Paper text:
In this study, we successfully generated an antibody that specifically recognizes the sulfated CCR5 through rabbit immunization and panning via phage display using a sulfated tyrosine-containing CCR5 N-terminal peptide. The N-terminal region of CCR5 contains four tyrosine residues, and their sulfation has been shown to increase HIV infection efficiency by approximately 50-fold. CCR5 is expressed on the surface of T cells and functions as a β-chemokine receptor, playing a crucial role in regulating the immune system. In summary, we successfully generated an anti-sulfated CCR5 antibody (BA8) and elucidated the molecular mechanism by which it specifically recognizes the sulfated antigen.
To elucidate the recognition mechanism of BA8 for sulfated peptides, we conducted an X-ray crystallographic analysis for the BA8-sulfated peptide complex. We determined the crystal structure of the complex at a resolution of 1.8 Å from the crystals derived from the mixed solution of BA8 and the sulfated peptide. The Fab was immobilized on a sensor chip using amine coupling, and the synthesized sulfated and non-sulfated N-terminal peptides of CCR5 were used as the analytes. The sulfated tyrosine peptide exhibited high binding affinity in the nanomolar range, while the non-sulfated peptide showed no binding within the tested concentration range. The crystal structure suggested that S52 interacts with 4Asp of the peptide, indicating its importance in maintaining peptide interaction regardless of sulfation. Given that BA8 did not bind non-sulfated peptides, S52 likely supports other residues to achieve the specific binding to the sulfated peptide. For example, the side chains of R34 and Y57 displayed restricted movement due to interactions with the sulfated peptide, and similar tendencies were observed for W46. These observations suggested that the binding of the Tys stabilized the specific side chain conformations of certain key residues, thereby contributing to the high specificity and affinity of the BA8 antibody for the sulfated CCR5 N-terminal peptide. Additionally, BA8 recognizes the sulfated peptides using the HC’s complementarity-determining region 1 (CDR1) and CDR2 as well as part of framework region two while utilizing very little of the heavy chain CDR3, which is usually the most diverse and generally the most critical for binding in antibodies.
Residue numbers in the entry:
A (entry chain H): 1 to 133, 136 to 226
B (entry chain L): 1 to 213
C (entry chain P): 1 to 11
Write the structure that this text describes.
């Protein structure tokens, strides 16, 4: 019994949002499906729902610009919302109704912005050369729109003590964040794996243990 | 048009104390007990703790208890722990709609810890972009700190952005990223870069000199 | 059967 939202990403003001909730392991004919959104840093809000018989319900602000429908043969519920404004920027969830309201989808981020999409550039974070050499290393992820990015370390095998900070929106409208991880000075290379779903961009960076050049390997960065 | 009103945010609670969050519905919830409680930590989706007003969801700690009926509901957290730092929402269902309360943020006061500080110069490849970002991290601290940046000893005002992790589920601590952004020309015009983190009367500092990296 | 009985009356 699970749900998955799709259709999120970047939209311009005036565009139409079309989210699909795809359900698995239960029947739409036995349950309501509710749509809930959450603006960044704000509260949960019920948008509307569709009942087990296919009739929809809406909150006052949604009613006149939202439609909620379903396809029982394709296991989907659709939210269509017209006339997007930046204030519609939010994570949108579908969830299975009933007295036990515990099964939600993972959520999909909707960004309404006049800005153009931009994939992240990634830069390694390592201590400045010159001290005695465990170490904390990181990746800076910057210049992207819309949210989110994902960041893993060594493809998700390295999770202990990972700190991935909340994103911050710059005046440019672009986002950035850093991720840091602490590792033992004598362990194998660490790689941050960054993804930006909106642009289908993947960026992986292997982070050196410091800014010092090692004697071996390539030497593509000289002081100037 | 049923509306739910909860305990004003934020609720500050010492570890081991008992937290109470109250929730009032302007109309009776359906059948008196269609009322759930949700927990949410920043950067994660909400998790149902309680449904049917008083039934604990699977795997939810015994510390949580829901009570009430009709229009008046309570969530209590017995012996609150760092893992319980979160925003809590009541959620009601009615004849023709559902709704959420405004949320009550619970901030858990644990044992004080001084930060350690790390500073990270820009890589050669970042300098090559024309815009430098220098990253400072303040690790595992409580209570909150303030951060300043010094460039050749001089405190900066502009080009600083800060981001803080939510309270750690084991020890209640925060982590902080602080970044200083400058042009590569500006970066190359100074030598010493310092991140200074202040927690009350105590300061921790980490520095690098550009020419050493 | 259904689980969203909140939306329905018997008659």
């Amino acid at each position: 019994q699970s749900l998955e939202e799709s259709g999120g990403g970047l939209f311009k003001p005036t565009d139409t949002l079309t989210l699909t909730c795809t359900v698995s392991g239960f029947s739409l004919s036995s349950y309501s499906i509710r749509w809930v959104r959450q603006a960044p840093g704000n509260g949960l809000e019920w948008i509307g729902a569709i009942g087990s018989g296919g009739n929809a319900y809406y909150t006052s602000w949604a009613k006149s610009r939202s439609t909620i429908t379903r396809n029982t043969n394709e296991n989907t519920v659709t939210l269509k919302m017209t006339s997007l404004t930046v204030a519609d920027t939010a994570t949108y969830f579908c969830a299975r109704g009933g007295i036990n309201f515990g099964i939600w989808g993972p959520g999909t981020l909707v960004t309404v912005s006049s800005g153009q999409p931009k994939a992240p550039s990634v830069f390694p974070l390592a201590p400045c050369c010159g001290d005695t050499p465990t170490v904390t290393l990181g990746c800076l992820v910057k210049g992207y729109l819309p949210e989110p990015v994902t960041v893993t370390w060594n493809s998700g095998t390295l999770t202990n003590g990972v700190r991935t900070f909340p994103s911050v929106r710059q005046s440019s409208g672009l986002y950035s964040l850093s991720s840091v991880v602490s590792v033992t000075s004598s362990s194998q290379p660490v790689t941050c794996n960054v993804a930006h779903p909106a642009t289908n961009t993947k960026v992986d960076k292997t982070v050196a243990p410091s800014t010092c050049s090692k004697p071996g390997g390539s030497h593509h960065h000289h002081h100037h | 048009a049923a509306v739910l009103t909860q305990t004003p945010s934020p609720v500050s609670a010492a570890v081991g104390s008992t937290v109470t969050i109250n929730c009032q519905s302007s109309q009776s919830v359906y059948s008196k007990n269609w009322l759930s409680w949700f927990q949410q930590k920043p950067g994660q989706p909400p998790k149902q703790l309680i449904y049917s007003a008083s039934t604990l969801d699977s795997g939810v700690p015994s510390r949580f208890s829901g009570s009430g009926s009709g229009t008046q509901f309570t969530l209590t957290i017995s012996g609150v722990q760092c893992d319980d730092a979160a925003t809590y929402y009541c959620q009601g269902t009615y004849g023709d709609a559902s709704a959420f309360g405004g949320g009550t943020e619970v901030v858990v006061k644990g044992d004080p810890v001084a930060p350690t500080v790390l500073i990270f110069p820009p890589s050669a490849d970042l300098v090559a972009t024309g815009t430098v970002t220098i990253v400072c991290v303040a690790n595992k601290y409580f209570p909150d700190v303030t951060v300043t940046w010094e460039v050749d000893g001089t405190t900066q005002t502009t080009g600083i952005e800060n981001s803080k992790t939510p309270q750690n589920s084991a020890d209640c601590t925060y982590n902080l990223s602080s970044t200083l952004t400058l042009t590569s020309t500006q970066y190359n015009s100074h030598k010493e870069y310092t991140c200074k983190v202040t927690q009350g009367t105590t300061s921790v500092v980490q520095s690098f000199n550009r020419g050493d990296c | 059967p259904i689980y969203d009985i909140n939306y329905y009356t018997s008659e």
